[PDB]
Design a protein around this ligand. Structure first.
Ligand code: MG
Ligand code: MG
Ligand code: MG
Ligand code: MG
Ligand code: MG
Ligand code: MG
Ligand code: MG
Ligand code: MG
Ligand code: MG
Ligand code: MG
Ligand code: MG
Ligand code: MG
Ligand code: MG
Ligand code: MG
Ligand code: MG
Ligand code: MG
Ligand code: MG
Ligand code: MG
Ligand code: MG
Ligand code: MG
Ligand code: MG
Ligand code: MG
Ligand code: MG
Ligand code: MG
Ligand code: MG
Ligand code: MG
Ligand code: MG
Ligand code: MG
Ligand code: MG
Ligand code: MG
Ligand code: MG
Ligand code: MG
Ligand code: MG
Ligand code: MG
Ligand code: MG
Ligand code: MG
Ligand code: MG
Ligand code: MG
Ligand code: MG
Ligand code: MG
Ligand code: MG
Ligand code: MG
Ligand code: MG
Ligand code: MG
Ligand code: MG
Ligand code: MG
Ligand code: MG
Ligand code: MG
Ligand code: MG
Ligand code: MG
Ligand code: MG
Ligand code: MG
Ligand code: MG
Ligand code: MG
Ligand code: MG
Ligand code: MG
Ligand code: MG
Ligand code: MG
Ligand code: MG
Ligand code: MG
Ligand code: MG
Ligand code: MG
Ligand code: MG
Ligand code: MG
Ligand code: MG
Ligand code: MG
Ligand code: MG
Ligand code: MG
Ligand code: MG
Ligand code: MG
Ligand code: MG
Ligand code: MG
Ligand code: MG
Ligand code: MG
Ligand code: MG
Ligand code: MG
Ligand code: MG
Ligand code: MG
Ligand code: MG
Ligand code: MG
Ligand code: MG
Ligand code: MG
Ligand code: MG
Ligand code: MG
Ligand code: MG
Ligand code: MG
Ligand code: MG
Ligand code: MG
Ligand code: MG
Ligand code: MG
Ligand code: MG
Ligand code: MG
Ligand code: MG
Ligand code: MG
Ligand code: MG
Ligand code: MG
Ligand code: MG
Ligand code: MG
Ligand code: MG
Ligand code: MG
Ligand code: MG
Ligand code: MG
Ligand code: MG
Ligand code: MG
Lengths: 122, 131, 48
RNA sequence: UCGAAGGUGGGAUCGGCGAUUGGGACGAAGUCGUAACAAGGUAGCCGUACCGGAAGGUGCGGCUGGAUC
RNA sequence: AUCAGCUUGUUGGUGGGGUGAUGGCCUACCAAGGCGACGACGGGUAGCCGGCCUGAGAGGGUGACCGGCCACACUGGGACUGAGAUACGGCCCAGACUCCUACGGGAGGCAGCAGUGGGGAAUAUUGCACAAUGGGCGCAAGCCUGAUGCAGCGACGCCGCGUGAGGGAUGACGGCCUUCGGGUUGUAAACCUCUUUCAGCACAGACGAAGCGCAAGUGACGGUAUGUGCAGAAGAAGGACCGGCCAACUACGUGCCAGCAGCCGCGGUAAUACGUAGGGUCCGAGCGUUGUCCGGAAUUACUGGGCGUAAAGAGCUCGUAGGUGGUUUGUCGCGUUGUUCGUGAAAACUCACAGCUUAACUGUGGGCGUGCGGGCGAUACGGGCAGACUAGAGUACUGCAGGGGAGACUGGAAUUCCUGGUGUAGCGGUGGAAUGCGCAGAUAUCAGGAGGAACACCGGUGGCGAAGGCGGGUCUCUGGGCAGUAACUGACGCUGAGGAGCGAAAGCGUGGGGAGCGAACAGGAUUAGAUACCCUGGUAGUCCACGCCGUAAACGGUGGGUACUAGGUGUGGGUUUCCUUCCUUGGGAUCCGUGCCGUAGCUAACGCAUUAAGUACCCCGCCUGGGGAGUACGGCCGCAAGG
């Protein structure tokens, strides 16, 4: 591109493909879960993961993955949701934090304890 | 069309250097003549002299080669061109080849070399980098 | 850093309408006289 | 005279929803098929018009990113 | 511009009013325009700046705190007062909300300091004083000041400190592995001595005040900070990681389950990638996750990218506005550097100094404060202006070759059909056969005629045209290009956003033509299947005139123009000269066009290589991972297909 072209037009910078737009750039939201069920991964991975449908304060319906091996979430439950991507599940972009509101840390955790919300043994 | 005598001169000179030629004939002009003058003064070229042609004056430049045939000129490039014209203040004189090259700057005195130009404190538009 | 040539149009005040098309004149600033004009004419140096 | 609020009436923009329909992508695995990649068994492709569940076929014009002789 | 016209006190003049001040600030009268492709009017977002982060720089992101302005005070308006009003706790009115009532009517605006309800991830205490300083009043004393100084809460951040040691074994328990030899946690630990910071308990105890008072005193902070003593190692450590990227591995438990995860990717009975144990790594009063911003990203490339095949040259020209110019002959100095005085508020950044025990903190003086103002001194380039020449370009004189274009006239061969002989049972067809036409006389063959399309050889990797493309002859008119003489013009040159004109085939309207060919559609054939490939027929179309659509792998997948850079081998066109027959692709010089192979060079490679993808200059279009998608909506053109 030549000098007169740059002067006449100007160069437009790239636009960023925003991720987790349901957060509106806000790291955490509170939500209430509507349904809890299971989903299947893609071809490379065969498993049976657990996901939940949560109503956000932003009035946006989004899936939410449940980490850990045990949970007590049922319909109409208070949930705190952060942002986190999973590969195997196609349309899941969020992970449910553990240890807040109605969810309690999964038992028998001693290694990597702070991530999953386990109190200290005495 | 023929739109930049100085760039044409620099490209013909460096093309002759690449092709290992010895003599180049170009149409004569004051800018070409005094640029050849400063080239002679710095010593990158061997010698120049003007001539007469079928129509108007022409200038011939003889390239410089040593015993071991390596090029006396490494490369040329023009920074100030029609359109993008670049200029330098009295303190931001460009550094070329880490000070081992030469920038041609037209000051109130004329086309003079960057080192003595900074010595005088004078400055202007940079013609080309020769190294 | 490339040099750009730009032009703006400013309307001035003359008392006789002595300026024709394609002439160059000198201008001075003044008090506002109406909307979008704040200038007067100095003198006409050349006429085309 | 001006004057905010209010009400009359029709034009634009942002929208939210809407039976049903059109299209797209991801699943995995099944039927129908042989399309393309080797002269892929009709050389390929491009523009265009028609036809057929389907990939496609044909007409006209253009290229070789086509192999033999 | 998926926003092309906007405006009517609008624009301008004159006369009046208006305001502290000029002014369509308001009125009347005159004229029609101003703003507009060097982006107006429209649509969305948003307080601006010194600053902060990132980056070497350019640049990008951003407006925490502080500070310079701006605008507002529940929403919308209006005005009085005053030297000074968006007048927040001033006024008036209309709205919504709340409150009191004895029902007759009234009172409100925490976006002031605290605090409550709601949203949220969440952000403090309904604290003490005018001791210091600013502000208001008053001659002063003195009064007021949620400005301000201070304290309380919160690891949220820049910064300092504490949870100890010296020595102590070829290394005491216990755990984990083992090859059953043993190795691990480990100078770690128990131990003998030490100072015990900071908390804990006591004493002294500030400065912050040459301040104010003609009084006798005045410190909230605080009886804290800070010193001086007492007792005791006594009261003090956790969080992530350990498959490769990436410093850190083994065992135990389930095996395509339960699960991990930033990219690749890890479990289908023996996982350094899952869970538990140890062991080690990183960090530390913080440790990770999450979200936003920069860098690497040269991944928007001015410095600093490409367009042959990966994304891209529009189909190609003419050409308006703009951008850029072939030599030297002349002023003013408006592109510009030439030096000096003259601004750059404070604060921040960078350099050195200095103080709080050093630490944040701040105490002083510099320096910094990268831009912009006027007076004095320069003329080499980079522009207008004030005069001449010509190396680009054009014209002029003579020749040149060409399927360049349009109209008209005309020729032959071939196919089909018709007419008339002759002539007999087959003719056409494919890998094989049958639908097809014949016995009403086919095929074959001779004579004649009719009509439509196209020009075999020359005809080629040859010519022309800008590109699609262009060839039977003849006439008519006409464009472009080339060589020599160089007479003349004397900066006229180039490319060209928007705009306009031409344009393969197919498609559409009207009206004609229609031999051959041939979408669609019928049959016959193959296949398990053919709505195809094959055969027999044949309707649009293919032809003509006028209009239309304007897309092609529209390819050299390469825009144009200019200057320079080694050769060899063919072709075409024209000028010259010399062996000279002066016949001869004889030999040589010159310019233009067009094929092939090759240096240096470039490119990731194939490859290009003077007709560059080589080395540059000028301008223009195009590209920023693949689908979605060259698609929806909107706008423009087209009668529609559609572009
Ligand atoms: Mg280029
Ligand atoms: Mg972990
Ligand atoms: Mg792990
Ligand atoms: Mg809608
Ligand atoms: Mg709906
Ligand atoms: Mg199948
Ligand atoms: Mg095939
Ligand atoms: Mg086949
Ligand atoms: Mg094929
Ligand atoms: Mg094919
Ligand atoms: Mg097609
Ligand atoms: Mg067909
Ligand atoms: Mg074709
Ligand atoms: Mg190929
Ligand atoms: Mg007046
Ligand atoms: Mg007056
Ligand atoms: Mg006015
Ligand atoms: Mg008036
Ligand atoms: Mg700045
Ligand atoms: Mg940088
Ligand atoms: Mg940068
Ligand atoms: Mg800003
Ligand atoms: Mg301030
Ligand atoms: Mg001001
Ligand atoms: Mg208001
Ligand atoms: Mg207001
Ligand atoms: Mg007000
Ligand atoms: Mg108030
Ligand atoms: Mg108030
Ligand atoms: Mg209020
Ligand atoms: Mg307050
Ligand atoms: Mg709340
Ligand atoms: Mg807080
Ligand atoms: Mg005071
Ligand atoms: Mg006194
Ligand atoms: Mg009082
Ligand atoms: Mg008081
Ligand atoms: Mg305080
Ligand atoms: Mg906290
Ligand atoms: Mg706490
Ligand atoms: Mg510390
Ligand atoms: Mg010890
Ligand atoms: Mg102490
Ligand atoms: Mg004192
Ligand atoms: Mg004293
Ligand atoms: Mg101390
Ligand atoms: Mg490792
Ligand atoms: Mg490592
Ligand atoms: Mg195992
Ligand atoms: Mg460890
Ligand atoms: Mg970044
Ligand atoms: Mg450049
Ligand atoms: Mg780039
Ligand atoms: Mg491509
Ligand atoms: Mg293209
Ligand atoms: Mg195109
Ligand atoms: Mg012009
Ligand atoms: Mg000057
Ligand atoms: Mg000065
Ligand atoms: Mg200055
Ligand atoms: Mg200062
Ligand atoms: Mg710095
Ligand atoms: Mg000190
Ligand atoms: Mg300083
Ligand atoms: Mg800076
Ligand atoms: Mg100019
Ligand atoms: Mg003359
Ligand atoms: Mg000429
Ligand atoms: Mg001819
Ligand atoms: Mg005609
Ligand atoms: Mg007959
Ligand atoms: Mg016959
Ligand atoms: Mg016919
Ligand atoms: Mg003459
Ligand atoms: Mg031209
Ligand atoms: Mg042009
Ligand atoms: Mg042009
Ligand atoms: Mg344009
Ligand atoms: Mg254009
Ligand atoms: Mg036209
Ligand atoms: Mg037309
Ligand atoms: Mg055709
Ligand atoms: Mg046609
Ligand atoms: Mg049709
Ligand atoms: Mg028609
Ligand atoms: Mg017709
Ligand atoms: Mg046919
Ligand atoms: Mg056919
Ligand atoms: Mg029939
Ligand atoms: Mg059929
Ligand atoms: Mg195209
Ligand atoms: Mg073509
Ligand atoms: Mg082109
Ligand atoms: Mg070019
Ligand atoms: Mg040549
Ligand atoms: Mg080489
Ligand atoms: Mg290479
Ligand atoms: Mg080559
Ligand atoms: Mg070339
Ligand atoms: Mg290139
Ligand atoms: Mg994109
Ligand atoms: Mg698709
Ligand atoms: Mg697309
Ligand atoms: Mg539309």
């Amino acid at each position: 591109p030549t000098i007169q072209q740059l002067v006449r037009k100007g160069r437009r910078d790239k636009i960023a493909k925003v991720k987790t737009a349901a957060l509106k750039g806000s790291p955490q939201r509170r939500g209430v879960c509507t349904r809890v069920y299971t989903t299947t991964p893609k071809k490379p991975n065969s498993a049976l993961r657990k996901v939940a449908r949560v109503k956000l304060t932003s009035q946006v319906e989004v899936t939410a993955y449940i980490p850990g091996e045990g949970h007590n979430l049922q319909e109409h439950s208070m949930v705190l949701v952060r942002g986190g991507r999973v590969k195997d599940l196609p349309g899941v972009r969020y992970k449910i934090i553990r240890g807040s509101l109605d969810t309690q840390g999964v038992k028998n955790r001693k290694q990597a304890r702070s991530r999953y919300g386990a109190k200290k043994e005495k | 069309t023929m739109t930049d005598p100085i760039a044409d001169f620099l490209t013909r000179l460096r093309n002759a250097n690449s092709a290992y030629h010895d003599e180049v004939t170009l149409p004569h002009s004051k800018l070409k003549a005094n640029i050849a003058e400063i080239l002679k003064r710095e010593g990158y070229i061997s010698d120049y002299r003007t001539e007469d042609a079928r129509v108007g004056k022409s200038l011939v430049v003889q390239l410089k080669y040593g015993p071991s045939r390596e090029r006396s000129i490494a490369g040329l490039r023009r920074v100030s061109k029609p359109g993008l014209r670049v200029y330098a203040k009295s303190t931001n004189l460009p550094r070329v080849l880490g000070g081992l090259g030469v920038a041609i700057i037209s000051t109130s005195s004329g086309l003079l070399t960057d080192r003595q130009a900074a010595r005088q404190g004078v400055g202007g538009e940079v013609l080309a980098y020769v190294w | 850093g490339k040099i750009i040539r730009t032009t703006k149009k400013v309307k001035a005040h003359d008392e006789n309408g002595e300026a024709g098309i394609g002439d160059r004149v000198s201008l001075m600033e003044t008090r506002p006289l109406s909307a979008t004009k704040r200038w007067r004419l100095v003198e006409i140096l050349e006429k085309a």
